[PDB]
Symmetry: D2
Subunit: 236 residues, 4 copies
């Protein structure tokens, strides 16, 4: 379907949920997908096998995206196998929801390190590896909570709002070397609140993944520094 000049993609935290669908979608469109996981290899291998069954190209790779050295090593491993890397999706993320008055500084750092620091490392390394080839596209998976806020999510909103803003700054740095940076802000996705969603249902993971795909693809070639809402009309 969608046109891609590039040949491969790394997706952080891709073993399950939205990360998994991104991998499926992109593999189905001819990209070699690198599925990142932290601990359980079984789940990632099962996804890789499922894609290979369908004739697609996929590999798995173990690392903690919040660890600088692990992320650097992982990219070097990909560069050795494929000769380079055209696309990166920073999807790795956690939640630790508490009312602010009950929330320790450690709770805040936890979510900042895994959600925002992870993405900084990814975007930085994408910049290093893609500048050689003078081409690339990077997508940061943010959230409606980063635009709008939410009760009990001071730490998560902070990290996703920081991600959105940070992505703009990278877009300026990547622009002359033709490396684009964009964010997606999904609403409520499957895997009462529905009342407020105009389309009247939760979004599928696939619908988020096809938006990520568009931003990576050649079709979005004059789009950089933008935030793409995928929330069913919940926030406009």
């Amino acid at each position: 379907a969608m046109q891609f000049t590039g040949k491969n993609v790394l997706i952080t935290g891709a073993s399950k949920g939205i990360g998994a669908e991104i991998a499926k979608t992109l593999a189905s469109m001819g990209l070699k997908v690198w599925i990142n996981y932290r601990s359980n290899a079984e789940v990632a291998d099962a996804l890789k096998n499922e894609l290979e069954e369908k004739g697609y190209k996929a590999a798995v790779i173990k690392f903690d995206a919040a660890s600088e050295s692990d992320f650097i090593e992982a990219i070097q491993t990909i560069v050795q196998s494929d000769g380079g890397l055209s696309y990166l999706v920073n999807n790795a993320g956690v939640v630790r929801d508490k009312l602010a008055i009950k929330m320790k500084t450690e709770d805040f750092h936890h979510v900042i390190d895994n959600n925002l620091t992870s993405a900084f490392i990814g975007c930085r390394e994408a910049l290093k590896v893609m500048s050689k080839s003078r081409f690339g596209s990077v997508v940061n998976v943010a959230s409606i909570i980063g635009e709008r806020g939410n009760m009990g999510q001071t730490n998560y909103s902070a990290s996703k709002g920081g991600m959105i803003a940070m992505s703009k700054s990278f877009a300026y740095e990547g622009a002359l070397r033709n490396i684009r940076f964009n964010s997606v802000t999904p609403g409520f996705i499957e895997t009462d609140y529905v009342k407020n969603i105009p389309l009247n249902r939760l979004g599928s993971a696939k619908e988020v993944a096809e938006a990520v795909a568009f931003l990576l693809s050649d079709h979005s070639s004059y789009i950089t520094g933008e935030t793409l809402k995928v929330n069913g009309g919940l926030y406009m």
Copy 2:
């Protein structure tokens, strides 16, 4: 080959510029394209012929998109010809730039009538014809000037900012019947202070047209009431 459940599209003001590219791009993806024009049939026919020579489906249809009765009649013609209409692009637009102190009320009305009232009529009629079949997607071609403003463009910014806000309201009204409404906000397009554009060049009409296509396509099925920036990083 972006995926479309729908089979045809109407594009206002499609004889030339961005409108023409939208027609080319969508016809190349298997949609039957209705090319709207006001006065000169030669130009529209030439485009229609060009597309048919490539094996695509295209027709031309004459109307003033600011005239309610003309727009209604045109849609009824398309409904009888094809059986329905799945997609609409409100692209018809003009400029009449002057400093505000030099601008007459008629200068303001001119740009409001052709840019915003035209879009209201289109969105309204899209809602009537598409609600039957409980499916549709509509794109309003707005502008960076609608988000940001500009010297000498009080009337243009008014009309495009009104378009963007109006589109959101339609999105609420179309949501339960699965009719999506979205806006595109192009930056400067070929058709300088390129200095200020991070990607360091003007956008092509294609690049705007492929963003429109994405918002019409099935890939954007959880995206409604959104505004998609296509400005090369000039506004983030």
Copy 3:
């Protein structure tokens, strides 16, 4: 309270509701307030009398803000009385809510003319009158419906979204002559229980609360703020 370099203000549609409060608030801060009305003079005169009895300066002035010639004449009248005009608030506005499929073109024009065209005429004339003295501030009273949209309000959202964007363009044009243009976007204001659940501050806003925001954007305290949109919605939209 708030510091104003300017001496007077025109407020469109000021006889009642939010417009009235703006007039009260600004008169209470030492400005001479010009209260615009279309038809009923009784209500405007009552408000003018109330303010004079408190020691404030006020006058009333009749015009349709959607009529260019009426608005031009009104400004000339004010210029003759006071010698100039430092502040303008475009507050005149109407609603005509319908689902889009039931809405006539004339329903759309009605709201555009009264809400957006009115503001264009005000902002334009403000620019002409304030550029002489190289000083002014103008506020456009928009709405949360202009940022966010709403079912049944294709015409209103259009007009207020247009007003917001149009204000920014005027800000660029006014900037070198130190004429500032800004918008306020009020949420739901009193002058219910469905709306209120969703409002974090858990109540409708008062007219006074919108009027003190307008006042801040006119005042010297907002002197580095231009082309901005100030939300006054109790957290309903962030």
Copy 4:
């Protein structure tokens, strides 16, 4: 010049620049201002003295706003002196500008810790101390770079964009107990081609916007971001 129901305010990083003006402006409007500093007491004392000589109420207080235990202790000290605290301004901030490819992880953390973590701690404690009395207002000093991004400022934009989003979440949590949270996003401020008003903003102009958001005049404004950039971003 402005009405305040509350009686006092804490301002982080208030010894100099924008922080200092906020202190001057708020003290000149009848608030007792607590001037926070990290290291150099001379500068803070001089400011406190200057304000007392003018008849105003001021004190200084030493702490690192990025340190949870320091910030908690400081608020407890204020509560014992004044009986409570109605207003807080998270102004403490730094920059460490580099192109991303030249930027170490520690350069990133440095700016996150001092700009965003500092604000989290302030907002959280403001929530604890103001809930008692069911009244308060808090302002986060963010930046245009948080809305818009900038070359060489991946870390700064991250921290200020995070601050802007975070403040909204606090606004939800504070709303029940009538505690408002808002951000200011200043443009380029003095210690130009692109700025419509054609000059850098003064610190005073930022300080009067902060004051408005703390004052009773902004009582139906919460979760908002107030641009103070002279038209440089709209």
